[PDB]
Short mmCIF file of C-alpha atoms in Angstrom, two decimals:
data_model
loop_
_atom_site.label_atom_id
_atom_site.label_comp_id
_atom_site.label_asym_id
_atom_site.label_seq_id
_atom_site.Cartn_x
_atom_site.Cartn_y
_atom_site.Cartn_z
CA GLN A 1 0.02 0.15 0.10
CA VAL A 2 0.90 3.90 0.15
CA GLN A 3 4.28 4.19 2.42
CA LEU A 4 5.74 7.43 3.31
CA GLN A 5 9.17 6.74 4.47
CA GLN A 6 11.13 9.68 5.91
CA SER A 7 14.86 10.29 6.59
CA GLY A 8 16.09 9.38 10.12
CA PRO A 9 16.39 12.13 13.06
CA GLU A 10 19.15 14.93 12.77
CA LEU A 11 21.20 16.90 15.28
CA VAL A 12 21.53 20.79 13.95
CA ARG A 13 23.77 23.04 14.88
CA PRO A 14 22.42 26.73 15.21
CA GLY A 15 22.60 28.83 11.95
CA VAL A 16 23.55 25.49 9.83
CA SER A 17 20.80 24.18 7.98
CA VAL A 18 19.30 20.43 7.23
CA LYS A 19 17.54 18.87 4.51
CA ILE A 20 15.16 15.59 5.40
CA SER A 21 13.35 13.43 3.11
CA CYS A 22 10.28 11.54 2.39
CA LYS A 23 10.33 8.56 -0.11
CA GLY A 24 6.71 7.74 -1.26
CA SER A 25 5.94 4.04 -2.39
CA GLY A 26 2.71 2.30 -3.51
CA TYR A 27 1.26 4.84 -5.50
CA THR A 28 2.38 7.08 -9.22
CA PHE A 29 4.68 8.98 -7.27
CA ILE A 30 4.34 12.11 -9.69
CA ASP A 31 0.95 12.19 -9.96
CA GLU A 32 0.26 13.29 -6.20
CA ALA A 33 1.27 16.31 -4.27
CA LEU A 34 3.08 16.01 -0.75
CA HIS A 35 2.36 18.21 2.09
CA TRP A 36 4.87 18.77 5.14
CA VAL A 37 3.95 19.65 8.69
CA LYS A 38 5.53 20.31 11.53
CA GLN A 39 4.84 19.45 15.06
CA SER A 40 6.34 21.26 18.06
CA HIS A 41 5.83 22.10 21.88
CA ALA A 42 5.18 25.69 21.45
CA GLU A 43 3.05 25.67 18.21
CA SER A 44 1.40 22.07 18.27
CA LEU A 45 0.80 21.08 14.17
CA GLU A 46 1.39 23.70 12.05
CA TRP A 47 1.08 23.14 7.96
CA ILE A 48 4.25 24.21 6.12
CA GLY A 49 3.44 23.57 2.54
CA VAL A 50 2.99 21.56 -0.28
CA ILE A 51 4.88 20.70 -3.38
CA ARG A 52 3.35 19.16 -6.42
CA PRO A 53 5.81 17.07 -8.49
CA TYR A 54 3.54 16.87 -11.79
CA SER A 55 3.76 20.24 -12.08
CA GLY A 56 6.85 21.69 -10.28
CA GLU A 57 4.56 23.96 -8.40
CA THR A 58 5.08 24.94 -4.78
CA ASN A 59 3.13 26.58 -2.24
CA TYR A 60 4.13 27.94 1.34
CA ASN A 61 2.75 28.82 4.60
CA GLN A 62 3.88 32.63 4.91
CA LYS A 63 5.26 32.01 8.41
CA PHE A 64 7.74 29.40 6.73
CA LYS A 65 8.71 30.89 3.42
CA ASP A 66 12.13 32.09 4.12
CA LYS A 67 13.15 29.20 6.06
CA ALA A 68 11.91 26.22 4.47
CA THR A 69 12.67 24.88 0.61
CA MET A 70 10.62 22.09 -1.13
CA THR A 71 12.18 19.98 -3.88
CA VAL A 72 11.55 16.85 -5.24
CA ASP A 73 13.53 13.69 -6.80
CA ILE A 74 10.79 11.99 -9.36
CA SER A 75 13.25 9.23 -10.83
CA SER A 76 13.77 8.04 -7.13
CA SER A 77 9.97 9.12 -5.33
CA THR A 78 11.51 11.32 -3.05
CA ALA A 79 11.08 14.94 -1.55
CA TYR A 80 13.19 17.06 0.16
CA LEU A 81 13.08 19.98 2.53
CA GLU A 82 15.23 22.12 3.34
CA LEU A 83 15.64 24.17 6.60
CA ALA A 84 17.32 27.07 6.74
CA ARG A 85 19.27 29.01 9.39
CA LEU A 86 17.72 27.02 12.30
CA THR A 87 17.34 28.05 15.76
CA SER A 88 15.87 26.08 18.47
CA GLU A 89 12.35 27.37 17.78
CA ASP A 90 13.40 25.06 14.85
CA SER A 91 13.79 21.61 17.18
CA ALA A 92 10.47 19.51 16.27
CA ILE A 93 8.96 16.53 14.78
CA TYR A 94 8.79 17.25 10.64
CA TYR A 95 6.10 15.02 9.02
CA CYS A 96 5.53 14.79 5.34
CA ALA A 97 1.90 13.34 4.16
CA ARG A 98 -0.11 12.97 1.12
CA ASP A 99 -4.03 14.32 0.85
CA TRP A 100 -6.91 12.35 -0.73
CA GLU A 101 -7.51 15.06 -3.71
CA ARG A 102 -10.69 16.04 -1.61
CA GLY A 103 -8.77 19.36 -0.61
CA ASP A 104 -5.65 19.87 2.06
CA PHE A 105 -6.17 17.16 4.68
CA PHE A 106 -3.99 14.36 5.40
CA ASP A 107 -5.05 10.57 4.95
CA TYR A 108 -1.31 8.83 4.67
CA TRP A 109 1.69 10.51 6.70
CA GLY A 110 5.54 10.07 7.14
CA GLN A 111 6.79 8.36 10.77
CA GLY A 112 8.36 11.71 11.10
CA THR A 113 12.30 13.15 11.41
CA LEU A 114 12.93 14.64 14.94
CA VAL A 115 15.88 17.35 14.13
CA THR A 116 17.18 18.78 17.39
CA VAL A 117 18.71 22.19 17.01
CA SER A 118 21.52 22.40 19.52
CA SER A 119 25.19 23.39 20.33
CA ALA A 120 25.75 20.03 21.91
CA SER A 121 27.76 17.13 20.52
CA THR A 122 26.41 13.74 19.45
CA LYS A 123 27.11 11.07 22.12
CA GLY A 124 26.12 7.65 21.69
CA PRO A 125 24.76 6.22 24.57
CA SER A 126 26.48 3.63 27.53
CA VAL A 127 24.18 0.61 27.94
CA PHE A 128 24.10 -1.06 31.51
CA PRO A 129 21.79 -3.88 32.82
CA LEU A 130 19.38 -3.85 35.29
CA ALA A 131 19.92 -7.62 36.47
CA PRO A 132 16.61 -9.23 38.01
CA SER A 133 16.99 -10.24 41.41
CA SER A 134 15.22 -11.28 44.19
CA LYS A 135 14.73 -7.37 45.13
CA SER A 136 13.05 -7.67 41.72
CA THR A 137 10.37 -10.53 41.82
CA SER A 138 6.72 -10.75 43.16
CA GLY A 139 5.44 -14.03 43.03
CA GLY A 140 6.13 -15.76 39.29
CA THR A 141 7.18 -12.90 37.78
CA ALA A 142 10.68 -11.03 37.90
CA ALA A 143 11.60 -7.26 36.71
CA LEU A 144 14.99 -6.38 34.39
CA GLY A 145 15.57 -3.51 31.66
CA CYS A 146 18.38 -1.62 30.73
CA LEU A 147 19.66 1.44 31.89
CA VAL A 148 20.40 3.78 28.48
CA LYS A 149 22.67 6.69 29.77
CA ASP A 150 23.66 10.01 28.47
CA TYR A 151 23.25 10.06 24.86
CA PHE A 152 22.62 13.48 22.77
CA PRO A 153 20.32 14.39 20.76
CA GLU A 154 16.78 12.15 21.24
CA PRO A 155 15.63 9.89 19.95
CA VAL A 156 16.77 6.43 20.43
CA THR A 157 14.74 3.05 20.43
CA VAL A 158 14.72 0.06 22.28
CA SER A 159 13.43 -3.45 21.59
CA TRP A 160 13.84 -6.62 23.62
CA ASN A 161 14.83 -10.05 22.10
CA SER A 162 14.87 -8.03 18.48
CA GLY A 163 11.17 -7.35 18.53
CA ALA A 164 10.39 -11.24 19.64
CA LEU A 165 9.53 -9.48 23.36
CA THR A 166 6.90 -6.67 23.24
CA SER A 167 4.43 -8.08 26.41
CA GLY A 168 5.61 -6.63 29.86
CA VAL A 169 8.04 -3.90 27.92
CA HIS A 170 7.83 -0.60 29.52
CA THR A 171 10.34 2.15 27.49
CA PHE A 172 10.18 5.43 29.55
CA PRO A 173 10.15 8.89 28.29
CA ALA A 174 13.96 10.54 27.87
CA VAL A 175 14.27 12.86 30.65
CA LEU A 176 17.39 15.37 30.22
CA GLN A 177 19.89 15.11 33.03
CA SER A 178 21.35 18.24 34.62
CA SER A 179 24.93 16.93 32.28
CA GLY A 180 22.45 18.21 29.01
CA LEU A 181 22.61 14.28 28.11
CA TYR A 182 19.83 12.34 28.15
CA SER A 183 19.38 9.11 29.67
CA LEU A 184 16.10 6.27 29.77
CA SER A 185 15.52 2.97 31.07
CA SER A 186 13.46 0.28 29.52
CA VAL A 187 12.24 -2.31 31.67
CA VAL A 188 10.29 -6.22 31.14
CA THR A 189 8.47 -8.43 33.67
CA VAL A 190 8.77 -11.93 32.81
CA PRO A 191 8.10 -15.39 34.39
CA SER A 192 10.74 -16.01 36.83
CA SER A 193 11.28 -19.76 35.67
CA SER A 194 11.93 -18.35 32.58
CA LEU A 195 15.28 -16.70 33.71
CA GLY A 196 17.16 -19.75 33.32
CA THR A 197 16.22 -20.83 29.81
CA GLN A 198 14.96 -17.56 27.80
CA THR A 199 17.84 -14.99 27.34
CA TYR A 200 16.97 -11.33 27.71
CA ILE A 201 18.48 -8.98 25.40
CA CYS A 202 17.86 -5.40 25.17
CA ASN A 203 18.71 -3.38 21.66
CA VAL A 204 19.00 -0.36 21.76
CA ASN A 205 19.60 2.04 18.66
CA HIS A 206 20.65 5.64 18.41
CA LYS A 207 20.43 6.96 15.01
CA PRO A 208 22.21 10.25 15.28
CA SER A 209 25.66 8.08 16.40
CA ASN A 210 25.30 5.20 13.90
CA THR A 211 25.05 2.69 17.20
CA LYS A 212 23.44 -0.05 17.72
CA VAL A 213 24.13 -2.19 21.00
CA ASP A 214 23.05 -5.18 22.59
CA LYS A 215 22.97 -6.19 25.76
CA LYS A 216 22.27 -9.36 27.57
CA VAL A 217 20.53 -9.05 31.14
CA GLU A 218 21.64 -11.79 33.22
CA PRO A 219 20.80 -12.39 37.09
CA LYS A 220 23.69 -11.24 39.07
CA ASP B 1 -5.05 32.87 9.31
CA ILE B 2 -8.15 30.92 10.51
CA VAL B 3 -7.93 30.09 14.20
CA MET B 4 -9.46 26.68 15.68
CA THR B 5 -10.36 26.92 19.00
CA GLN B 6 -10.45 23.18 20.53
CA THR B 7 -12.32 22.75 24.09
CA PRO B 8 -11.86 21.04 26.25
CA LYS B 9 -8.04 20.37 26.30
CA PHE B 10 -8.04 17.54 28.62
CA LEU B 11 -11.13 14.98 29.44
CA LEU B 12 -11.48 12.24 32.02
CA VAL B 13 -13.47 9.15 31.07
CA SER B 14 -14.29 5.72 31.96
CA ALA B 15 -13.81 2.97 28.98
CA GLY B 16 -17.69 2.15 27.78
CA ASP B 17 -18.45 6.31 28.27
CA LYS B 18 -19.34 9.16 25.83
CA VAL B 19 -16.66 11.70 24.70
CA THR B 20 -17.59 14.83 23.03
CA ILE B 21 -15.30 17.03 21.63
CA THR B 22 -15.84 20.59 20.22
CA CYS B 23 -13.65 22.67 17.75
CA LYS B 24 -14.35 26.41 17.06
CA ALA B 25 -13.53 28.12 14.09
CA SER B 26 -12.44 31.77 13.88
CA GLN B 27 -14.73 32.41 10.64
CA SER B 28 -16.76 29.98 8.34
CA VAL B 29 -14.88 26.99 7.05
CA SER B 30 -18.11 25.48 5.61
CA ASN B 31 -17.76 21.90 5.71
CA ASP B 32 -13.80 21.41 5.05
CA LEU B 33 -13.02 20.29 8.71
CA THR B 34 -11.16 17.20 9.33
CA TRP B 35 -10.53 15.37 12.72
CA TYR B 36 -7.08 13.26 13.53
CA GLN B 37 -6.34 10.64 16.47
CA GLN B 38 -2.81 10.85 17.27
CA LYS B 39 -1.70 8.06 19.90
CA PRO B 40 1.73 8.17 21.87
CA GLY B 41 4.81 8.08 19.37
CA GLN B 42 2.53 7.77 16.43
CA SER B 43 1.61 10.42 13.49
CA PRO B 44 -1.84 11.80 13.45
CA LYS B 45 -4.42 8.97 11.94
CA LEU B 46 -7.05 10.72 9.56
CA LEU B 47 -10.83 9.84 11.56
CA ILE B 48 -13.44 12.14 10.28
CA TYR B 49 -13.17 14.33 6.69
CA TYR B 50 -15.70 16.84 5.24
CA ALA B 51 -16.97 17.13 9.04
CA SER B 52 -18.71 13.97 9.09
CA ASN B 53 -17.62 11.56 6.65
CA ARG B 54 -15.87 8.23 8.42
CA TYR B 55 -12.87 7.63 6.61
CA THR B 56 -12.13 4.68 5.37
CA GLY B 57 -11.78 1.58 8.01
CA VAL B 58 -12.80 3.82 10.91
CA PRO B 59 -15.12 2.39 13.50
CA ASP B 60 -18.32 3.34 13.87
CA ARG B 61 -17.81 4.53 17.53
CA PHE B 62 -16.13 8.00 16.16
CA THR B 63 -18.42 10.59 14.21
CA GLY B 64 -18.34 13.59 13.23
CA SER B 65 -20.97 16.97 12.99
CA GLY B 66 -21.40 20.92 12.30
CA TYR B 67 -21.04 23.11 9.75
CA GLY B 68 -19.80 26.59 9.42
CA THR B 69 -17.70 27.93 12.72
CA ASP B 70 -19.15 24.80 15.47
CA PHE B 71 -18.02 21.64 15.20
CA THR B 72 -18.66 18.24 17.18
CA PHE B 73 -16.28 15.18 17.65
CA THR B 74 -17.95 11.89 19.67
CA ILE B 75 -16.50 9.01 20.62
CA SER B 76 -20.10 7.22 21.21
CA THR B 77 -18.50 4.33 23.75
CA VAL B 78 -14.97 5.19 24.01
CA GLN B 79 -12.82 2.33 24.41
CA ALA B 80 -9.57 1.96 26.57
CA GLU B 81 -7.25 1.99 23.35
CA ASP B 82 -8.87 5.33 22.29
CA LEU B 83 -6.36 7.27 24.63
CA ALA B 84 -4.96 9.69 22.32
CA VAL B 85 -4.96 13.56 21.56
CA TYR B 86 -7.64 14.18 18.84
CA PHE B 87 -7.21 17.40 16.48
CA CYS B 88 -9.15 19.26 14.36
CA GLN B 89 -8.09 21.11 11.19
CA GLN B 90 -9.78 23.34 8.78
CA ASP B 91 -8.96 23.19 4.77
CA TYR B 92 -11.29 25.97 3.53
CA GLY B 93 -9.00 28.91 3.34
CA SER B 94 -4.92 29.14 3.03
CA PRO B 95 -2.82 28.02 5.32
CA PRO B 96 -4.47 25.10 6.46
CA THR B 97 -4.68 25.42 10.40
CA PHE B 98 -5.03 22.72 13.17
CA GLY B 99 -6.81 23.47 16.85
CA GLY B 100 -4.70 22.81 19.93
CA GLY B 101 -5.43 19.11 20.42
CA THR B 102 -7.93 17.42 23.03
CA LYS B 103 -6.33 14.62 25.04
CA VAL B 104 -8.30 11.86 25.77
CA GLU B 105 -7.33 10.34 29.12
CA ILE B 106 -8.92 7.04 30.67
CA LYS B 107 -10.37 6.50 34.06
CA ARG B 108 -10.12 2.86 35.54
CA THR B 109 -9.99 1.53 39.01
CA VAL B 110 -7.25 2.37 41.43
CA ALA B 111 -4.24 0.01 41.28
CA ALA B 112 -1.38 -0.16 43.51
CA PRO B 113 1.99 -0.31 41.93
CA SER B 114 4.73 -2.79 42.39
CA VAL B 115 7.73 -1.54 43.61
CA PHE B 116 11.48 -2.81 42.25
CA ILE B 117 14.51 -1.52 43.17
CA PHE B 118 18.16 -1.80 41.22
CA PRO B 119 21.59 -1.30 42.19
CA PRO B 120 24.05 0.00 39.54
CA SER B 121 25.83 -2.49 37.95
CA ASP B 122 29.58 -3.05 38.33
CA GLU B 123 29.83 -2.27 34.87
CA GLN B 124 28.64 1.36 35.32
CA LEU B 125 30.63 1.83 38.62
CA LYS B 126 33.67 2.13 36.38
CA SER B 127 32.94 5.01 35.04
CA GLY B 128 32.62 6.88 38.46
CA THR B 129 29.00 6.92 38.60
CA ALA B 130 26.35 5.04 40.30
CA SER B 131 22.60 4.61 39.07
CA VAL B 132 20.08 3.36 41.19
CA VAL B 133 16.49 2.87 39.50
CA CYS B 134 13.34 2.28 41.35
CA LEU B 135 10.18 0.96 39.57
CA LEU B 136 7.00 1.76 40.18
CA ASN B 137 5.35 -0.55 37.47
CA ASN B 138 1.25 -0.79 36.37
CA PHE B 139 -0.33 1.47 38.40
CA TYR B 140 -3.52 3.79 39.14
CA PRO B 141 -3.76 6.74 39.44
CA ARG B 142 -0.57 8.25 38.04
CA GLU B 143 -0.51 10.41 40.85
CA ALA B 144 2.30 8.78 43.23
CA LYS B 145 5.22 10.18 45.70
CA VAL B 146 8.70 8.51 45.90
CA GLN B 147 11.18 9.71 48.10
CA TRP B 148 15.24 8.15 48.27
CA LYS B 149 17.15 7.28 51.41
CA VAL B 150 20.78 6.76 51.67
CA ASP B 151 21.57 5.27 55.32
CA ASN B 152 18.06 6.26 56.51
CA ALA B 153 19.36 10.44 55.11
CA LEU B 154 16.39 11.83 52.69
CA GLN B 155 17.64 12.83 49.48
CA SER B 156 16.88 15.83 47.72
CA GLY B 157 18.01 17.22 44.28
CA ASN B 158 19.93 14.02 42.98
CA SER B 159 16.99 12.46 41.30
CA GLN B 160 14.76 12.52 38.42
CA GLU B 161 11.23 10.24 37.24
CA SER B 162 9.77 9.35 34.16
CA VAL B 163 6.36 8.41 33.90
CA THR B 164 4.86 5.81 30.34
CA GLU B 165 1.95 7.47 28.86
CA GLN B 166 -1.41 4.91 29.82
CA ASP B 167 -1.10 1.86 28.74
CA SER B 168 -3.62 1.34 25.80
CA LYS B 169 -4.56 -1.97 26.99
CA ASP B 170 -4.58 -2.22 31.12
CA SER B 171 -5.37 2.04 31.47
CA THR B 172 -2.03 1.51 33.91
CA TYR B 173 0.85 3.71 34.13
CA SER B 174 4.52 2.70 35.04
CA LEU B 175 7.03 5.35 36.72
CA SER B 176 10.91 5.51 37.27
CA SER B 177 13.20 7.20 39.51
CA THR B 178 16.71 7.27 39.33
CA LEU B 179 19.09 8.28 41.85
CA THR B 180 22.27 9.49 40.41
CA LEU B 181 25.62 9.16 42.88
CA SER B 182 29.11 9.62 42.46
CA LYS B 183 31.00 6.09 42.91
CA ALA B 184 32.94 7.40 46.02
CA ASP B 185 29.37 8.33 47.57
CA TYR B 186 27.58 5.32 46.43
CA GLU B 187 31.13 3.30 47.95
CA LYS B 188 30.50 5.23 51.35
CA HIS B 189 26.79 4.00 52.32
CA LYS B 190 25.29 0.94 52.84
CA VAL B 191 21.47 1.12 52.75
CA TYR B 192 19.61 2.28 49.56
CA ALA B 193 15.69 2.48 50.30
CA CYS B 194 13.17 3.61 47.52
CA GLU B 195 9.94 4.91 49.35
CA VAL B 196 6.80 4.92 47.57
CA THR B 197 3.57 6.98 48.37
CA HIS B 198 0.40 5.61 46.24
CA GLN B 199 -3.15 6.08 46.64
CA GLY B 200 -3.70 1.85 46.55
CA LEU B 201 -1.39 1.23 48.90
CA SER B 202 -2.54 1.85 53.04
CA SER B 203 0.87 3.26 53.73
CA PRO B 204 4.07 3.55 52.19
CA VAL B 205 5.99 0.87 50.66
CA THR B 206 9.69 0.69 50.64
CA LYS B 207 12.18 -1.23 48.84
CA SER B 208 15.58 -1.45 49.72
CA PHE B 209 19.49 -3.27 49.16
CA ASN B 210 22.49 -3.34 51.05
CA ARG B 211 25.36 -2.53 48.86
CA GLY B 212 27.46 -6.00 48.25
#
């Protein structure tokens, strides 16, 4: 079916430009307009503009025209959004979206691209075990986890057993530490009897540092 | 530009009950009004277009009505998985503009947290820092008070909390509280304790360990 695949998260220094992308598949790319939408804390959802690949026509929200530029590569089925002279107010999730030819409303959305504008350097996470013990058992269930510490920028993704374990998993929202680095934990509750038969591995991926780390969490 | 005003900002509703969300436009927008649902960590999802038409595959419990400036989104019988921020959006005048969102929160019975404590790993101590993690699992309501004691001394200014979004199936929350100490300070003390106060508990619950 119709899919909009966006490029990964980006850390950008203030005053530097960034170009993010959106690849469409599952339809005739040239025939359909693509829209860009910003989502931030301060201003919620805001429409940035629309590009029509078939004609090359572009239209901008007047608020965004100065700093945003839309382009497309029809051969690679990819639309691009360039954002210039970034400031902290530009830190946001940016979506591309299709309309349903019934006006400017959006039936298919990309997964979003997180842009962080900051002077702080990229740092990949340190991943430590939260080992199950008797101090983390409750009847026939034990809690265990991974501490994903000291990284920048957001986001990280965490899975368990390469996605084979999803039930009972809680991955906490990251918190910004006094150091200016993010930290989070991901935890899971499992049968205490499985602790000797099934191994538990957390898979921690931090795209801005191009790191993937797998940590086996065992009773200490 | 056309300003879209959503009310309420927040609502708390029990499963099976009705949700009514209103969107008001700064000028007439005909029937050019759309409603989206946005669940945590996801892109918005189209539910209602042309003010009152259900988009493809959208359940019958979701409806929209209105014309002009005053619009209504309804969940007739809300389900636990319907927790989300709902947005209205006009596409009558350029630029298309969105309302500020309504966050739909689920009410359920009180559930006490299960509390677990985690010492720092030996691997971490090598770095000169120790993190102690206190986990409160699967509780309701979100309101909770968590305190740290180190050799019975109350800690202040060296811990941070994180809370999950409400679970889409059981409507509960989980919370972490993380205490950050230098390795030196961690090694100077013996008893590490996390104290949890919650409505589902008759008195506070403490989980602790002894270093070593």
